[PDB]
Design a protein around this ligand. Structure first.
Ligand SMILES: [Mg+2]
Ligand SMILES: [Mg+2]
Ligand SMILES: [Mg+2]
Ligand SMILES: [Mg+2]
Ligand SMILES: [Mg+2]
Ligand SMILES: [Mg+2]
Ligand SMILES: [Mg+2]
Ligand SMILES: [Mg+2]
Ligand SMILES: [Mg+2]
Ligand SMILES: [Mg+2]
Ligand SMILES: [Mg+2]
Ligand SMILES: [Mg+2]
Ligand SMILES: [Mg+2]
Ligand SMILES: [Mg+2]
Ligand SMILES: [Mg+2]
Ligand SMILES: [Mg+2]
Ligand SMILES: [Mg+2]
Ligand SMILES: [Mg+2]
Ligand SMILES: [Mg+2]
Ligand SMILES: [Mg+2]
Ligand SMILES: [Mg+2]
Ligand SMILES: [Mg+2]
Ligand SMILES: [Mg+2]
Ligand SMILES: [Mg+2]
Ligand SMILES: [Mg+2]
Ligand SMILES: [Mg+2]
Ligand SMILES: [Mg+2]
Ligand SMILES: [Mg+2]
Ligand SMILES: [Mg+2]
Ligand SMILES: [Mg+2]
Ligand SMILES: [Mg+2]
Ligand SMILES: [Mg+2]
Ligand SMILES: [Mg+2]
Ligand SMILES: [Mg+2]
Ligand SMILES: [Mg+2]
Ligand SMILES: [Mg+2]
Ligand SMILES: [Mg+2]
Ligand SMILES: [Mg+2]
Ligand SMILES: [Mg+2]
Ligand SMILES: [Mg+2]
Ligand SMILES: [Mg+2]
Ligand SMILES: [Mg+2]
Ligand SMILES: [Mg+2]
Ligand SMILES: [Mg+2]
Ligand SMILES: [Mg+2]
Ligand SMILES: [Mg+2]
Ligand SMILES: [Mg+2]
Ligand SMILES: [Mg+2]
Ligand SMILES: [Mg+2]
Ligand SMILES: [Mg+2]
Ligand SMILES: [Mg+2]
Ligand SMILES: [Mg+2]
Ligand SMILES: [Mg+2]
Ligand SMILES: [Mg+2]
Ligand SMILES: [Mg+2]
Ligand SMILES: [Mg+2]
Ligand SMILES: [Mg+2]
Ligand SMILES: [Mg+2]
Ligand SMILES: [Mg+2]
Ligand SMILES: [Mg+2]
Ligand SMILES: [Mg+2]
Ligand SMILES: [Mg+2]
Ligand SMILES: [Mg+2]
Ligand SMILES: [Mg+2]
Ligand SMILES: [Mg+2]
Ligand SMILES: [Mg+2]
Ligand SMILES: [Mg+2]
Ligand SMILES: [Mg+2]
Ligand SMILES: [Mg+2]
Ligand SMILES: [Mg+2]
Ligand SMILES: [Mg+2]
Ligand SMILES: [Mg+2]
Ligand SMILES: [Zn+2]
Lengths: 204, 37, 140, 16, 174
RNA sequence: CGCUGAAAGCAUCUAAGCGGGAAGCCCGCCCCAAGAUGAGGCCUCCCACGGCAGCCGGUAAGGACCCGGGAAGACCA
RNA sequence: CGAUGUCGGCUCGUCGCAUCCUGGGGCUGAAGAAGGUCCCAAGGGUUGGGCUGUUCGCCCAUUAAAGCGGCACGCGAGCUG
């Protein structure tokens, strides 16, 4: 089950067969495997992947030990791809070909303390006809004496976004090995310059 | 299948079966098939 | 003359083979062993029962049609969050829990009853990792 | 849905 | 008025080895094991198997008759063998043998493929008749049923898949 | 809805056994999660310093404070 | 009764199933298509508008369907009045 780490760079649209396709560019390769997890040693199967070069000054001592055991230059982020064993010591964009269908994980844009209307799409209150300082309020949150409490899970205001979101089954439009570029069709979670993970889709 | 609390034989060809905790009635006559409930 | 109060004594480890035993009938005896009520210097306000290793929990036995009809029950606090798990399935997914849940319910509730449940160590399969305590193999 | 209208049992509260 | 007591004639050369809660039967066509309640006793005599029951309570009376027939169907199984025939009725409706497999064309958009499970052999003599043959009784009947279900007798026409010897009962339309 | 099948010489989906069968159930998908006090696992770094399962002082790996900020954000994080 | 705010609407739902639809079935006076009738099933879904304070109902135009009920006839320290 192949995967790769990357950065969201920006969107555009290209032309393919008199059709405009919205795309998102992701800079994916190259990612050196710096640990492998096995059923003996760890209980399961994964490949720990590294991404983006780091100023070795900024990498502390417990971390320096970890890279050296891999034969690997210091790296900004570590992330695993589960149930994955590439034969090489380095994973690149060459593992996805145009037409392939992928899933991408990103960290969503953060809307901070979000109101009930933005977060959960409540209807708010009326805007005239006597509506009184409730125009964006949630309304009732319960019943009366029975049950006489509020359910767990009840949708209310609170922080929104800045959370892990996966969007699935996106079409791979192109790959440009010469630039470690990956062109996926559609929209990817997070802001430009954001970290993402690209896996083979779990969709049939 | 008829479902009712009173299951009786309808014709002389009906047979009373008890099957998996339930009283049934089977027969060659497709109407007459019954189960209690 | 005031009643005897023991000084803290060393708890005996004990081994039980659950294979083929009746679920609840094994349970009462493990509970008794856990309270320590088989000890003449029993004291209700201190943990002084035995430790109990149990093996072969997966091959415990139960009477009647409870295989399909004993439902274990769990509520999450969310609306509609009462899940229902038949006995069969519990054996097939976390077998050691059938014995644990049975024993748990037979120990007193409160802080002491919860620590005695800890003193019970239940395993499915023929083996356990408790060699270091060299548990005395009891019949029950 | 109760078919017979039920009387109010408290007045609309006033400053009184 | 009693089945379990009736002795089972065993044609030579087949063998009946008794075992705790099972019995084994080998013959010219193969072997089979018959699961048998520890309460019943299976007895190997000369060219004969008999079964006896521990008492006259209902359950023993019920396991008795079953155990004989179960064993007896195993006996006949590995010597004479079992078979059931299926007649295919209706115009477009035909059959053919695809490799070892059974090809059914009975008026869907597609043909039907039935695979022979282990211990089953399909025979296609004519386009409109098919034979299921094997040493297991309970298995031959299951398969035939499985094949029949693919296109059961119309209630209004002589059309579909029938058992050999299945009476044609139809209702009037209009 | 069956297969095989007694009791009950026949019949029976059942009493022994075996099939097929739902947008429903269990899993699978996405998110949270070891305060899971039952507090898990792996990789890697530190070291057995002084004075009197303890206290006190200085340190190690490391961390915090402070500062420039940030599609992170009420403060906090 | 030294106070348990009362219809309807809005808002937010959650539950029951005696199921309106969608799924699985038996019987049919089931040719096909389409219905009738009972059984299983609460996962999801179950529209917009005219009249009236209305709930309900009637009507217009659609619909797979335009389900019925409980939660102080849910919900006024949430709004309307
Ligand atoms: Mg991320
Ligand atoms: Mg709002
Ligand atoms: Mg939103
Ligand atoms: Mg909106
Ligand atoms: Mg609105
Ligand atoms: Mg309004
Ligand atoms: Mg608005
Ligand atoms: Mg006002
Ligand atoms: Mg005002
Ligand atoms: Mg205003
Ligand atoms: Mg109220
Ligand atoms: Mg209130
Ligand atoms: Mg309450
Ligand atoms: Mg946040
Ligand atoms: Mg192209
Ligand atoms: Mg952006
Ligand atoms: Mg009569
Ligand atoms: Mg009959
Ligand atoms: Mg004892
Ligand atoms: Mg006491
Ligand atoms: Mg387990
Ligand atoms: Mg208790
Ligand atoms: Mg108490
Ligand atoms: Mg012989
Ligand atoms: Mg004798
Ligand atoms: Mg007609
Ligand atoms: Mg039949
Ligand atoms: Mg039969
Ligand atoms: Mg009779
Ligand atoms: Mg049975
Ligand atoms: Mg089955
Ligand atoms: Mg079944
Ligand atoms: Mg079938
Ligand atoms: Mg679906
Ligand atoms: Mg996580
Ligand atoms: Mg922890
Ligand atoms: Mg965690
Ligand atoms: Mg717990
Ligand atoms: Mg830990
Ligand atoms: Mg700031
Ligand atoms: Mg009053
Ligand atoms: Mg007062
Ligand atoms: Mg008062
Ligand atoms: Mg008052
Ligand atoms: Mg008051
Ligand atoms: Mg119902
Ligand atoms: Mg239907
Ligand atoms: Mg029809
Ligand atoms: Mg017609
Ligand atoms: Mg019908
Ligand atoms: Mg019915
Ligand atoms: Mg029925
Ligand atoms: Mg439902
Ligand atoms: Mg629900
Ligand atoms: Mg509903
Ligand atoms: Mg108007
Ligand atoms: Mg109106
Ligand atoms: Mg109206
Ligand atoms: Mg008006
Ligand atoms: Mg009216
Ligand atoms: Mg319709
Ligand atoms: Mg309407
Ligand atoms: Mg409701
Ligand atoms: Mg109500
Ligand atoms: Mg009310
Ligand atoms: Mg109210
Ligand atoms: Mg008010
Ligand atoms: Mg009101
Ligand atoms: Mg109030
Ligand atoms: Mg109040
Ligand atoms: Mg409000
Ligand atoms: Mg007024
Ligand atoms: Zn009849």
């Amino acid at each position: 089950m192949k995967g790769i780490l990357g950065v969201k760079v920006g969107m555009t649209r290209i032309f393919r067969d008199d059709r405009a396709v919205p795309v998102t560019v992701i800079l994916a390769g190259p990612c050196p495997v710096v640990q492998r997890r096995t059923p003996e040693k760890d209980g399961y199967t994964a490949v720990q992947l590294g991404f983006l070069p780091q100023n070795p000054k900024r990498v502390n001592r417990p971390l320096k030990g970890h890279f050296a055991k891999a034969g690997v230059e210091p790296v900004r982020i570590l992330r695993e791809i589960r149930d994955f064993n590439p034969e090489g010591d380095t994973v690149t964009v060459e593992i996805f070909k145009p037409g392939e269908r992928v899933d991408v994980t990103g960290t969503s844009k953060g809307r901070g303390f979000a109101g009930v209307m933005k977060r959960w799409n409540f209807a708010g209150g009326p805007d005239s006809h006597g509506a009184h300082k409730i125009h964006r309020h949630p309304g009732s949150i319960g019943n009366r004496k029975t049950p006489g409490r509020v359910y767990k899970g009840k949708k209310m205001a609170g922080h929104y976004g800045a959370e892990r979101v996966t969007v699935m089954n996106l079409e791979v439009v192109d790959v440009i090995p010469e630039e470690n570029l990956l062109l996926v069709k559609g929209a990817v979670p997070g802001p430009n310059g954001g970290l993402v993970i690209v896996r083979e889709t779990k969709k049939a | 299948m008829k479902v009712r609390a009173s299951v009786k034989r309808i014709c002389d060809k009906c047979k009373v079966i008890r099957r998996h905790g339930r009283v049934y009635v089977i027969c060659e006559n497709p109407k007459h098939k019954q189960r209690q409930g | 003359m005031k009643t005897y109060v023991p000084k803290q004594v060393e708890p005996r480890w004990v081994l039980i083979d659950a294979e083929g035993k009746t679920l609840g009938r094994l349970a009462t005896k493990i509970a008794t062993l856990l309270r320590g009520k088989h000890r003449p210097d029993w004291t209700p306000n201190v943990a002084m029962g035995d430790f109990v290793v149990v093996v072969n929990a997966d091959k415990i036995r139960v009477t009647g049609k409870k295989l399909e009809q004993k439902i274990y029950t769990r509520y999450s606090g969310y609306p509609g969050g009462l899940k229902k798990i038949p006995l069969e399935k519990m054996l097939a997914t976390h077998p050691e829990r059938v014995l644990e849940h049975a024993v748990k319910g037979m120990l007193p509730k409160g802080p002491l009853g919860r620590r005695l449940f800890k003193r019970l160590k239940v395993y499915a399969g023929p083996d356990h990792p408790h060699q270091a305590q060299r548990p005395e193999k009891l019949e029950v | 849905r109760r078919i017979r209208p039920r009387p109010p049992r408290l007045p609309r509260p006033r400053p009184r | 008025s009693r089945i379990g007591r009736l002795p089972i004639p065993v044609p030579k050369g087949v063998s009946v080895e008794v075992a705790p809660g099972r019995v084994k039967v080998k013959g010219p066509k193969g072997e089979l094991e018959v699961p048998v309640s520890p309460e019943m006793r299976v007895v190997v005599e000369e060219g004969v198997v008999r079964v006896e029951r521990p008492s006259d309570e209902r359950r023993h009376k019920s396991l008795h008759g079953l155990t004989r027939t179960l064993i007896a169907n195993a006996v006949k199984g590995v010597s004479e063998g079992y078979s059931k025939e299926l007649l295919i009725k209706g115009i477009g409706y035909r059959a053919r043998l695809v490799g070892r497999a059974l090809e059914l064309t009975v008026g869907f958009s597609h043909p039907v493929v039935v695979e022979p499970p282990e211990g089953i052999t399909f025979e296609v003599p004519e386009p409109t008749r098919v034979r299921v043959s094997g040493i297991d009784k309970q298995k031959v009947g299951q398969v035939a049923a499985n094949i029949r279900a693919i296109r059961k007798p119309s209630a209004y026409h002589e059309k579909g898949i029938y058992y050999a010897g299945e009476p044609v009962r139809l209702k009037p339309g209009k």
